[PDB]
Amino acid sequence: SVIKPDMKIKLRMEGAVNGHPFAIEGVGLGKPFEGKQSMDLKVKEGGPLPFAYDILTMAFNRVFAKYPENIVDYFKQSFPEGYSWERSMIYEDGGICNATNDITLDGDCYICEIRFDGVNFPANGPVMQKRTVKWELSTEKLYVRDGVLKSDGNYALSLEGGGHYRCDFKTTYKAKKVVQLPDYHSVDHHIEIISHDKDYSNVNLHEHAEAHSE
């Protein structure tokens, strides 16, 4: 009924990094059952962003994930009511970001309200000096605790010249109604900035995600 092969995305993000506030809006399309999506993002407030844009892209919805039939799909069941998530991201040099997302459905469009706040990134680190290039393949491990869905991952940005910059994700997902809870599974995420402006005021973002079990 509710989940169609082609859906739209409309999103706004408001946040701050190291005290510098900003606002981004996005428009996109995705195929939920194939686990693919794309969106065009425009910076609307916050000058030219002074930090590496890669710290944001995982914040810009696990309904866009190919789930096989032997894994319970916590996310596609949760609609039309929807779900929210809460996330903390801890980088190996002390920068920490918190984020929230409230995802509702309206017609064939997902509406996303995102808040993002990062602090304590050093001035000579790869985020403030924009020395990140892309995220490696990311494996999210999802499990259940106290009746909500949690997930961990240990991800890595590659850096210009080689080497990697490590970040640990912790997410809590909360469906806005009772749904059936899955078993321990994992989701592989491929995130790619396909095209960007000079100072990243216009970014075209793509993600591909599939779930796996045994």
PDB file of C-alpha atoms in Angstrom, residues 51-199:
ATOM      1  CA  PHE A  51      34.251  22.147   7.221  1.00  0.00           C
ATOM      2  CA  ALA A  52      34.461  18.992   5.116  1.00  0.00           C
ATOM      3  CA  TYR A  53      31.024  18.173   3.700  1.00  0.00           C
ATOM      4  CA  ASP A  54      31.573  14.426   4.214  1.00  0.00           C
ATOM      5  CA  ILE A  55      30.662  14.734   7.888  1.00  0.00           C
ATOM      6  CA  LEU A  56      27.062  15.441   6.840  1.00  0.00           C
ATOM      7  CA  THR A  57      26.234  12.939   4.109  1.00  0.00           C
ATOM      8  CA  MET A  58      25.259  10.017   6.349  1.00  0.00           C
ATOM      9  CA  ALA A  59      22.717  12.342   7.962  1.00  0.00           C
ATOM     10  CA  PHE A  60      21.065  13.228   4.633  1.00  0.00           C
ATOM     11  CA  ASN A  61      16.739   7.051   5.985  1.00  0.00           C
ATOM     12  CA  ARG A  62      16.908   3.261   6.101  1.00  0.00           C
ATOM     13  CA  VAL A  63      13.662   2.755   4.188  1.00  0.00           C
ATOM     14  CA  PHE A  64      16.069   3.087   1.247  1.00  0.00           C
ATOM     15  CA  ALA A  65      17.665  -0.324   1.726  1.00  0.00           C
ATOM     16  CA  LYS A  66      17.127  -3.598  -0.137  1.00  0.00           C
ATOM     17  CA  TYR A  67      15.910  -6.043   2.492  1.00  0.00           C
ATOM     18  CA  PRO A  68      15.720  -9.775   1.630  1.00  0.00           C
ATOM     19  CA  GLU A  69      12.650 -11.753   2.654  1.00  0.00           C
ATOM     20  CA  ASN A  70      14.243 -13.553   5.628  1.00  0.00           C
ATOM     21  CA  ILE A  71      15.032 -10.252   7.444  1.00  0.00           C
ATOM     22  CA  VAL A  72      12.297  -8.219   9.125  1.00  0.00           C
ATOM     23  CA  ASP A  73      12.158  -4.712   7.641  1.00  0.00           C
ATOM     24  CA  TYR A  74      11.684  -2.482  10.695  1.00  0.00           C
ATOM     25  CA  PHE A  75      11.700   0.595   8.495  1.00  0.00           C
ATOM     26  CA  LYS A  76       9.263  -0.199   5.683  1.00  0.00           C
ATOM     27  CA  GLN A  77       6.691  -1.432   8.235  1.00  0.00           C
ATOM     28  CA  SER A  78       6.834   1.780  10.210  1.00  0.00           C
ATOM     29  CA  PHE A  79       4.945   3.844   7.663  1.00  0.00           C
ATOM     30  CA  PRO A  80       2.758   5.882   7.032  1.00  0.00           C
ATOM     31  CA  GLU A  81       3.348   6.979  10.670  1.00  0.00           C
ATOM     32  CA  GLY A  82       7.128   6.894  10.289  1.00  0.00           C
ATOM     33  CA  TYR A  83      10.122   6.825  12.568  1.00  0.00           C
ATOM     34  CA  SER A  84      12.823   9.024  13.997  1.00  0.00           C
ATOM     35  CA  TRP A  85      16.443   8.422  14.796  1.00  0.00           C
ATOM     36  CA  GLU A  86      19.085   9.733  17.199  1.00  0.00           C
ATOM     37  CA  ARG A  87      22.763   9.423  16.323  1.00  0.00           C
ATOM     38  CA  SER A  88      26.155  10.232  17.753  1.00  0.00           C
ATOM     39  CA  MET A  89      29.334  10.123  15.686  1.00  0.00           C
ATOM     40  CA  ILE A  90      32.706  10.084  17.470  1.00  0.00           C
ATOM     41  CA  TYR A  91      35.822  10.788  15.397  1.00  0.00           C
ATOM     42  CA  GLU A  92      39.213   9.507  16.460  1.00  0.00           C
ATOM     43  CA  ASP A  93      40.664  13.019  17.033  1.00  0.00           C
ATOM     44  CA  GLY A  94      37.912  14.202  19.409  1.00  0.00           C
ATOM     45  CA  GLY A  95      35.317  15.808  17.163  1.00  0.00           C
ATOM     46  CA  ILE A  96      31.828  14.623  18.087  1.00  0.00           C
ATOM     47  CA  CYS A  97      28.602  15.141  16.113  1.00  0.00           C
ATOM     48  CA  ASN A  98      25.043  14.551  17.350  1.00  0.00           C
ATOM     49  CA  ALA A  99      22.114  14.336  14.987  1.00  0.00           C
ATOM     50  CA  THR A 100      18.363  13.719  14.927  1.00  0.00           C
ATOM     51  CA  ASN A 101      15.966  13.049  12.075  1.00  0.00           C
ATOM     52  CA  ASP A 102      12.205  12.959  12.130  1.00  0.00           C
ATOM     53  CA  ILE A 103      10.884  11.186   9.042  1.00  0.00           C
ATOM     54  CA  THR A 104       7.225  11.481   8.034  1.00  0.00           C
ATOM     55  CA  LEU A 105       5.383  10.464   4.876  1.00  0.00           C
ATOM     56  CA  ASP A 106       3.115  12.730   2.862  1.00  0.00           C
ATOM     57  CA  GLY A 107       1.714  11.259  -0.330  1.00  0.00           C
ATOM     58  CA  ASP A 108       4.630   9.701  -2.147  1.00  0.00           C
ATOM     59  CA  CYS A 109       7.161  12.000  -0.405  1.00  0.00           C
ATOM     60  CA  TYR A 110       9.348  11.467   2.671  1.00  0.00           C
ATOM     61  CA  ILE A 111       9.657  14.680   4.742  1.00  0.00           C
ATOM     62  CA  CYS A 112      12.882  14.806   6.789  1.00  0.00           C
ATOM     63  CA  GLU A 113      13.557  17.281   9.639  1.00  0.00           C
ATOM     64  CA  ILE A 114      17.287  17.039  10.530  1.00  0.00           C
ATOM     65  CA  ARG A 115      19.338  18.657  13.319  1.00  0.00           C
ATOM     66  CA  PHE A 116      23.136  18.296  13.277  1.00  0.00           C
ATOM     67  CA  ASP A 117      25.621  19.660  15.839  1.00  0.00           C
ATOM     68  CA  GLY A 118      29.366  19.052  15.865  1.00  0.00           C
ATOM     69  CA  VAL A 119      31.940  20.366  18.338  1.00  0.00           C
ATOM     70  CA  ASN A 120      35.625  20.031  19.224  1.00  0.00           C
ATOM     71  CA  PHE A 121      37.033  19.461  15.737  1.00  0.00           C
ATOM     72  CA  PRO A 122      40.681  20.622  15.799  1.00  0.00           C
ATOM     73  CA  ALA A 123      41.645  23.474  13.465  1.00  0.00           C
ATOM     74  CA  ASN A 124      44.418  21.446  11.818  1.00  0.00           C
ATOM     75  CA  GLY A 125      42.413  18.242  11.454  1.00  0.00           C
ATOM     76  CA  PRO A 126      41.079  16.727   8.243  1.00  0.00           C
ATOM     77  CA  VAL A 127      37.562  18.056   8.790  1.00  0.00           C
ATOM     78  CA  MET A 128      38.393  21.733   9.323  1.00  0.00           C
ATOM     79  CA  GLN A 129      41.090  21.682   6.645  1.00  0.00           C
ATOM     80  CA  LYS A 130      38.883  19.759   4.161  1.00  0.00           C
ATOM     81  CA  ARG A 131      41.290  16.895   3.495  1.00  0.00           C
ATOM     82  CA  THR A 132      38.674  14.092   3.245  1.00  0.00           C
ATOM     83  CA  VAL A 133      37.873  12.457  -0.100  1.00  0.00           C
ATOM     84  CA  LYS A 134      35.199   9.768   0.420  1.00  0.00           C
ATOM     85  CA  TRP A 135      33.732   7.287   2.912  1.00  0.00           C
ATOM     86  CA  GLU A 136      34.691   3.642   2.574  1.00  0.00           C
ATOM     87  CA  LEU A 137      32.021   0.969   2.348  1.00  0.00           C
ATOM     88  CA  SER A 138      30.226   1.098   5.683  1.00  0.00           C
ATOM     89  CA  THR A 139      28.773  -1.926   7.493  1.00  0.00           C
ATOM     90  CA  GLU A 140      26.028  -1.008   9.965  1.00  0.00           C
ATOM     91  CA  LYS A 141      25.253  -3.678  12.562  1.00  0.00           C
ATOM     92  CA  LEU A 142      21.645  -3.518  13.851  1.00  0.00           C
ATOM     93  CA  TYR A 143      20.357  -5.194  17.018  1.00  0.00           C
ATOM     94  CA  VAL A 144      17.492  -4.769  19.483  1.00  0.00           C
ATOM     95  CA  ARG A 145      17.649  -3.469  23.035  1.00  0.00           C
ATOM     96  CA  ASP A 146      14.795  -2.371  25.324  1.00  0.00           C
ATOM     97  CA  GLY A 147      12.392  -2.724  22.425  1.00  0.00           C
ATOM     98  CA  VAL A 148      14.055  -0.186  20.127  1.00  0.00           C
ATOM     99  CA  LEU A 149      16.473  -0.809  17.284  1.00  0.00           C
ATOM    100  CA  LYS A 150      20.093   0.206  17.859  1.00  0.00           C
ATOM    101  CA  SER A 151      23.002   0.132  15.460  1.00  0.00           C
ATOM    102  CA  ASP A 152      26.790   0.526  15.590  1.00  0.00           C
ATOM    103  CA  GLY A 153      29.382   0.978  12.896  1.00  0.00           C
ATOM    104  CA  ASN A 154      33.094   1.726  12.687  1.00  0.00           C
ATOM    105  CA  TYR A 155      33.561   3.722   9.516  1.00  0.00           C
ATOM    106  CA  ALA A 156      36.463   5.444   7.851  1.00  0.00           C
ATOM    107  CA  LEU A 157      36.980   8.412   5.578  1.00  0.00           C
ATOM    108  CA  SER A 158      39.939   8.255   3.251  1.00  0.00           C
ATOM    109  CA  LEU A 159      42.255  11.275   3.216  1.00  0.00           C
ATOM    110  CA  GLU A 160      44.114  13.069   0.433  1.00  0.00           C
ATOM    111  CA  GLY A 161      47.466  11.371   0.136  1.00  0.00           C
ATOM    112  CA  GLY A 162      46.409   8.123   1.747  1.00  0.00           C
ATOM    113  CA  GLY A 163      45.456   6.989   5.194  1.00  0.00           C
ATOM    114  CA  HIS A 164      42.097   6.910   6.850  1.00  0.00           C
ATOM    115  CA  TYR A 165      40.208   8.939   9.420  1.00  0.00           C
ATOM    116  CA  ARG A 166      38.065   6.844  11.713  1.00  0.00           C
ATOM    117  CA  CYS A 167      34.596   7.506  13.111  1.00  0.00           C
ATOM    118  CA  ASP A 168      32.264   5.410  15.308  1.00  0.00           C
ATOM    119  CA  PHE A 169      28.505   5.684  14.760  1.00  0.00           C
ATOM    120  CA  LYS A 170      25.806   4.855  17.317  1.00  0.00           C
ATOM    121  CA  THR A 171      22.171   5.132  16.206  1.00  0.00           C
ATOM    122  CA  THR A 172      18.831   4.573  17.905  1.00  0.00           C
ATOM    123  CA  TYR A 173      15.758   4.097  15.657  1.00  0.00           C
ATOM    124  CA  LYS A 174      12.227   4.603  17.020  1.00  0.00           C
ATOM    125  CA  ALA A 175       9.184   3.679  14.933  1.00  0.00           C
ATOM    126  CA  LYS A 176       6.165   5.812  15.753  1.00  0.00           C
ATOM    127  CA  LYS A 177       3.966   2.719  16.186  1.00  0.00           C
ATOM    128  CA  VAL A 178       4.455  -0.875  17.251  1.00  0.00           C
ATOM    129  CA  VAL A 179       6.141  -2.921  14.532  1.00  0.00           C
ATOM    130  CA  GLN A 180       7.807  -6.313  14.433  1.00  0.00           C
ATOM    131  CA  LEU A 181      11.431  -6.238  15.614  1.00  0.00           C
ATOM    132  CA  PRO A 182      14.210  -7.849  13.554  1.00  0.00           C
ATOM    133  CA  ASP A 183      17.079 -10.110  14.575  1.00  0.00           C
ATOM    134  CA  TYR A 184      20.748  -9.169  14.450  1.00  0.00           C
ATOM    135  CA  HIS A 185      21.535  -8.211  10.876  1.00  0.00           C
ATOM    136  CA  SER A 186      23.782  -5.808   8.987  1.00  0.00           C
ATOM    137  CA  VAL A 187      23.378  -3.198   6.238  1.00  0.00           C
ATOM    138  CA  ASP A 188      26.162  -2.293   3.790  1.00  0.00           C
ATOM    139  CA  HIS A 189      26.081   1.392   2.762  1.00  0.00           C
ATOM    140  CA  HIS A 190      27.751   2.974  -0.262  1.00  0.00           C
ATOM    141  CA  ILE A 191      27.730   6.788  -0.068  1.00  0.00           C
ATOM    142  CA  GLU A 192      29.091   8.881  -2.873  1.00  0.00           C
ATOM    143  CA  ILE A 193      29.160  12.593  -3.633  1.00  0.00           C
ATOM    144  CA  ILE A 194      28.575  12.424  -7.376  1.00  0.00           C
ATOM    145  CA  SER A 195      28.962  16.119  -8.260  1.00  0.00           C
ATOM    146  CA  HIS A 196      29.587  19.264  -6.286  1.00  0.00           C
ATOM    147  CA  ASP A 197      29.915  23.024  -6.643  1.00  0.00           C
ATOM    148  CA  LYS A 198      33.276  24.656  -5.905  1.00  0.00           C
ATOM    149  CA  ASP A 199      32.526  25.316  -2.219  1.00  0.00           C
TER     150      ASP A 199
END
